[PDB]
Amino acid sequence: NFTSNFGPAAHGVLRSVLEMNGEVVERAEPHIGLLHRGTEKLIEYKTYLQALPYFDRLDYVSTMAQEHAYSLAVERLLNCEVPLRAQYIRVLFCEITRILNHLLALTTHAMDVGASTPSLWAFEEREKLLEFYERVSGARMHASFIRPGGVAQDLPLGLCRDIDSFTQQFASRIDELEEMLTGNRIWKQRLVDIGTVTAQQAKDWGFSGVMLRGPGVCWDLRRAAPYDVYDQLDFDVPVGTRGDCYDRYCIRIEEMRQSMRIIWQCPNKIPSGMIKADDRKLCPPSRCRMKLSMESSIHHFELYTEGFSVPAPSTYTAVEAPKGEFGVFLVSNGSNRPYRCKIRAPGFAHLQGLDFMSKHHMLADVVTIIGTQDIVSGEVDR
Amino acid sequence: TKLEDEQREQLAKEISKDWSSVFERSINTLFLTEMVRGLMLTLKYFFETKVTINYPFEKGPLSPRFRGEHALRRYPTGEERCIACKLCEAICPAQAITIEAEEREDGSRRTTRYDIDMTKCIYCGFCQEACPVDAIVEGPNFEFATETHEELLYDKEKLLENGDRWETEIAENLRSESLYR
Amino acid sequence: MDNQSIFKYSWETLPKKWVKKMERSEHGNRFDTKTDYLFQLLCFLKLHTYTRVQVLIDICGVDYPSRKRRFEVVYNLLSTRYNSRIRVQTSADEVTRISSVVSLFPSAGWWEREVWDMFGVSSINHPDLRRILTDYGFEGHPLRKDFPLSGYVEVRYDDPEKRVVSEPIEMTQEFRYFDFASPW
Amino acid sequence: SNHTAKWMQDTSKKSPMELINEVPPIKVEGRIVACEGDTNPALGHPIEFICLDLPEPAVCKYCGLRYVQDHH
Amino acid sequence: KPWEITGPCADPEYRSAVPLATEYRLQCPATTKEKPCIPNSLPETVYDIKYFSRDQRRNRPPIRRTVLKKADVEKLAKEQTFAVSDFPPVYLNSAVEEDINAIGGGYQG
Amino acid sequence: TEAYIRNKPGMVSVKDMPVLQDGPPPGGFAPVRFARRIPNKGPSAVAIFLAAFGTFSWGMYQVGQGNKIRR
Amino acid sequence: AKVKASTGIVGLEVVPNAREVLIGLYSKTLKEIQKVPEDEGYRKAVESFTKHRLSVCKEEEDWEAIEKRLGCGQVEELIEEAQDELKLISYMIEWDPWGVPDDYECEVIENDAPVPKHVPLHRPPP
Numbered sequence A: 001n002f003t004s005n006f007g008p009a010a011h012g013v014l015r016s017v018l019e020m021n022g023e024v025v026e027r028a029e030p031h032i033g034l035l036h037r038g039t040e041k042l043i044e045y046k047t048y049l050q051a052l053p054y055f056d057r058l059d060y061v062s063t064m065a066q067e068h069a070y071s072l073a074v075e076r077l078l079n080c081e082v083p084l085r086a087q088y089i090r091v092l093f094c095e096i097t098r099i100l101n102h103l104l105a106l107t108t109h110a111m112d113v114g115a116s117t118p119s120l121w122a123f124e125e126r127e128k129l130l131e132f133y134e135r136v137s138g139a140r141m142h143a144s145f146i147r148p149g150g151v152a153q154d155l156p157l158g159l160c161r162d163i164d165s166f167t168q169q170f171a172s173r174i175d176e177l178e179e180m181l182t183g184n185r186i187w188k189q190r191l192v193d194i195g196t197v198t199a200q201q202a203k204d205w206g207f208s209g210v211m212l213r214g215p216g217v218c219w220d221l222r223r224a225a226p227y228d229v230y231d232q233l234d235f236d237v238p239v240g241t242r243g244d245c246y247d248r249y250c251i252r253i254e255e256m257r258q259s260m261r262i263i264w265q266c267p268n269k270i271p272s273g274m275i276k277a278d279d280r281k282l283c284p285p286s287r288c289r290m291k292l293s294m295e296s297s298i299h300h301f302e303l304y305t306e307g308f309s310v311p312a313p314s315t316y317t318a319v320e321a322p323k324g325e326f327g328v329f330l331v332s333n334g335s336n337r338p339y340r341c342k343i344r345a346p347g348f349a350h351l352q353g354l355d356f357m358s359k360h361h362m363l364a365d366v367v368t369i370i371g372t373q374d375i376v377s378g379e380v381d382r
Numbered sequence B: 001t002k003l004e005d006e007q008r009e010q011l012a013k014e015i016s017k018d019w020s021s022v023f024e025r026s027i028n029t030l031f032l033t034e035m036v037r038g039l040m041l042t043l044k045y046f047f048e049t050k051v052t053i054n055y056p057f058e059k060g061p062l063s064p065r066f067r068g069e070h071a072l073r074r075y076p077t078g079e080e081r082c083i084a085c086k087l088c089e090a091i092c093p094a095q096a097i098t099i100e101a102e103e104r105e106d107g108s109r110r111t112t113r114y115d116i117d118m119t120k121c122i123y124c125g126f127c128q129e130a131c132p133v134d135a136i137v138e139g140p141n142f143e144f145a146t147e148t149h150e151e152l153l154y155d156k157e158k159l160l161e162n163g164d165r166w167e168t169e170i171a172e173n174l175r176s177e178s179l180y181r
Numbered sequence C: 001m002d003n004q005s006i007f008k009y010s011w012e013t014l015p016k017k018w019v020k021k022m023e024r025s026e027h028g029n030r031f032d033t034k035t036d037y038l039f040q041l042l043c044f045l046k047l048h049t050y051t052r053v054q055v056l057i058d059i060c061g062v063d064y065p066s067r068k069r070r071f072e073v074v075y076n077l078l079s080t081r082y083n084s085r086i087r088v089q090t091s092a093d094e095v096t097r098i099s100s101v102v103s104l105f106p107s108a109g110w111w112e113r114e115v116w117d118m119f120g121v122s123s124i125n126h127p128d129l130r131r132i133l134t135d136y137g138f139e140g141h142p143l144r145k146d147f148p149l150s151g152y153v154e155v156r157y158d159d160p161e162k163r164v165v166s167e168p169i170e171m172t173q174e175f176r177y178f179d180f181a182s183p184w
Numbered sequence D: 001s002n003h004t005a006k007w008m009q010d011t012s013k014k015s016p017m018e019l020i021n022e023v024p025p026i027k028v029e030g031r032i033v034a035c036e037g038d039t040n041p042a043l044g045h046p047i048e049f050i051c052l053d054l055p056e057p058a059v060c061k062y063c064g065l066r067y068v069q070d071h072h
Numbered sequence E: 001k002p003w004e005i006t007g008p009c010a011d012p013e014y015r016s017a018v019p020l021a022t023e024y025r026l027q028c029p030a031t032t033k034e035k036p037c038i039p040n041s042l043p044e045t046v047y048d049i050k051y052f053s054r055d056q057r058r059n060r061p062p063i064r065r066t067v068l069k070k071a072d073v074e075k076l077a078k079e080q081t082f083a084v085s086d087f088p089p090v091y092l093n094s095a096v097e098e099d100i101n102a103i104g105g106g107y108q109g
Numbered sequence F: 001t002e003a004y005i006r007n008k009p010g011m012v013s014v015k016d017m018p019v020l021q022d023g024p025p026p027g028g029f030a031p032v033r034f035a036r037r038i039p040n041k042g043p044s045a046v047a048i049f050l051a052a053f054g055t056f057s058w059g060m061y062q063v064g065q066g067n068k069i070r071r
Numbered sequence G: 001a002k003v004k005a006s007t008g009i010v011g012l013e014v015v016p017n018a019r020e021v022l023i024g025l026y027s028k029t030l031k032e033i034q035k036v037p038e039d040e041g042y043r044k045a046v047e048s049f050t051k052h053r054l055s056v057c058k059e060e061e062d063w064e065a066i067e068k069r070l071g072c073g074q075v076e077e078l079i080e081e082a083q084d085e086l087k088l089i090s091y092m093i094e095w096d097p098w099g100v101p102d103d104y105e106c107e108v109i110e111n112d113a114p115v116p117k118h119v120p121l122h123r124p125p126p
């Protein structure tokens, strides 16, 4: 049994070591500490409103579902309701983020396997969506836009019209991409029956997201525990019949289309009203009030110096991120700094997956497995 | 693996119903019609126009809610805006601001040293939200790519004051964000 | 308002010998148990044909540097069939070999290695292999309340003297700590 | 002379203090004023009602404008 | 055009991805032709501020604790009795093998 | 701290005070498309097979006539 | 009629002997819990519901009908659950823990802290 190394597209930094035999991967094992930062230690020596950008930095492809999960955790721990327009725009952008992540993962998978034109077309579409981000608030990626209790700024005018234009042209673009890949005998023979996963060992190794929904078992948090407006937003939730690379791929495309259905359902129901709060003790007052009234200045000052204090208990909060069940565990006590905020990105489950499900294959199939897993070492290590 | 033998039989007994079906599927997989379809789509995109923004002459689209090279504005009278609240330093999530003040001679309070080591300053935005007088702001300039770390350690307010070379442009943005912010 | 059913049934049919505390909150239902029966309790679940959990979501450590039992291990795990999740939370001190669950849920080797180096809590059976997250030979366990934010020895720079080296910390612009507290 | 010497370096163009002394007083008519500039937002400088019952100008503590009562 | 015989390029419900200036963004984000006044409060609050009744936060019940001994354990074990029903409920859901063009003629969403 | 800021001009009560102008126009802009649709309109089986076989036979006949000329 | 097409899950494999295997498994579990363990708790529960499921499968006798009436996912999934339950019983009697000796505290804690409706909570299945 050879002992080969694998230190590679730019599909992240990761160190695979492979006990090999001929062209068979008898045992693959990843070394993962290669990008560590101490995000939990920092959050602790930090705060709530100051630690939001950390969640923005974890899993840096899907750059808003993380803030959405952290905001849900703080609200649950805090009992701070949020207005309907805030909920609606927040779901809208969570779904745009899902589409972003799916484009990137799917077409980077296509590049690992060998295609390139899908990568470039998907990256054009990603440019459009990132333009939506940077128009609404902040830079292209890492838009710290979902604070505890709602959003930071209202969205501009015309953004909905642009959303609609993108919706139509993007239905067409997904159709093009699927025609380009789904059905090409090369892609089919390269993807199908590569990395089968029975639901028993799926639930054992603790997969989530598309992975868990690949082979059989039909369970996503949006339908099970519908955290946000999602009820009024009926959708489809596809499910694969024989868990493997091809079925996870088709799941991803159907999830893109369902996300389009949601992204249209929102700008038809969005209830024009207020955003983000009704207490200038958990959400800071806007500029006019802050510079005209008196107690608004007191609350702005206290809220940007020490932040809000949340009570004693500890909670767990999960969100259907584009990858899987992104989890946050808060152990806050009294004071304004989050005691022991623990992350539960699905990267760990997916890498142990790689370990067991990458046996008795070839190195091209190892690359294919990483592709279909859609790993981001940022979130797997944090 | 006994079932796979049984499954592969039915799957063949199902699609191979008539002769037309087998013949069609065979010359389908034998004349590469999906290959031809992919090639034709590709050739269409080839003939079609491009994107290729041609950077150094026509830059990309932005939004007044942009974040970039910081700046310290000042009143129309030429009088500085910053008053040393320490709010920007307090809310800095990266602690990338250092600020040290003193009572001036005429009486008003101002900043003796104010610096933002731009690197350690990730560009998050909280600056322009904590300021009660709109002193510090993020002008829409992203072309500053010096060749020595020390520069990106923007100096003790001096270069930050020179952000006023954008004072017109920045001003525009602020007006368009006075409504909803 | 979520999973009173599974929790109630699990508590009313359990062998009540090995349950030290039960909390039916609305944040999350807690079975605080003794570290001696943890494997027994978890193997009861995942097998009983009503409260079958079958998936372990997280194994996180919490540090309380003011109690005799310093650490706190926590297992967050759901039931995909019965749409419910519970949080089994055990206590653990400095060196005290805690049982493993890699036999039941194979998805704990990585989470148990992570709780081996981040914290210092041991693990008697297999999963206590070498460290995972922290880089290499590392002095402390860098997530308790003692390992400072900037680390003991962390300067790491190139040396044309030889090649590259790791030397003790002499960082500039020391970490400022603001107070912000509020006596009401 | 010392503060602007601590922060400013050029000493060719006039310092902020010099400009805000170059602007003359306002000579308002009543007994109480409020300094922002000309807009309520987008110009900051929250309301800073300042009395005018002394024979010398009164500074504003943001953007010192030195209002002065006109008549007796 | 020579391709135009099969694929999305030969479908009347097909759109390209080169949105012209006038049709995509005819109003720049800065100087719009309107004047938006975002809401920030409800009238009831803005003229009847009352922060405890608004801040039902910190208005939560206290944490209630109880200890149990062998006597109470035995009593509960005896009084307790299961039933053929309401053990827990089950959360069952299965595949359906639905089409694609169904919902709203395959359009609305 | 909200009345005139939000809207000063002419209202008699706090209700019906502001003008918002935030969301979509009346109608939902469209019904949009989300389902795939790839028409299959190429010559399916017998057309292409007869094309291949006929052009092969005729090309062979032409090769024959040409080799006659060359001889 | 209508033997089966596919259970829908990848790990489970259909079996036409659903009724017979369920009868055998349930009889065995009834016998095991009937003779072996002490008459408390877990034993009470398992006796009750297992004899229930035995009776209902034996009476319905048509696997479609046994699913539709018993009200659980699939006969295969029920087979899995029964096998796992019997395995659990074996483990339990290997390390028989029944009976609280004395000096026993089980602190029941409860706080009714209200949480908003827009937070992920596993709403009960109807």
Ligand code: SF4
Binding pocket: B081, B082, B083, B084, B085, B086, B087, B088, B089, B130, B131, B132, B133, B134, B135, B136
């Ligand atoms: S908040 Fe504004 S004026 Fe106040 S100390 Fe900072 S930039 Fe300076």
Ligand code: SF4
Binding pocket: B088, B091, B092, B093, B094, B095, B096, B097, B116, B120, B121, B122, B123, B124, B125, B126, B127, B128
């Ligand atoms: S932009 Fe953010 S990172 Fe930079 S100093 Fe200002 S508040 Fe901090």
Ligand SMILES: [Zn+2]
Binding pocket: D035, D036, D045, D060, D061, D062, D063, D064, D065
């Ligand atoms: Zn002034």
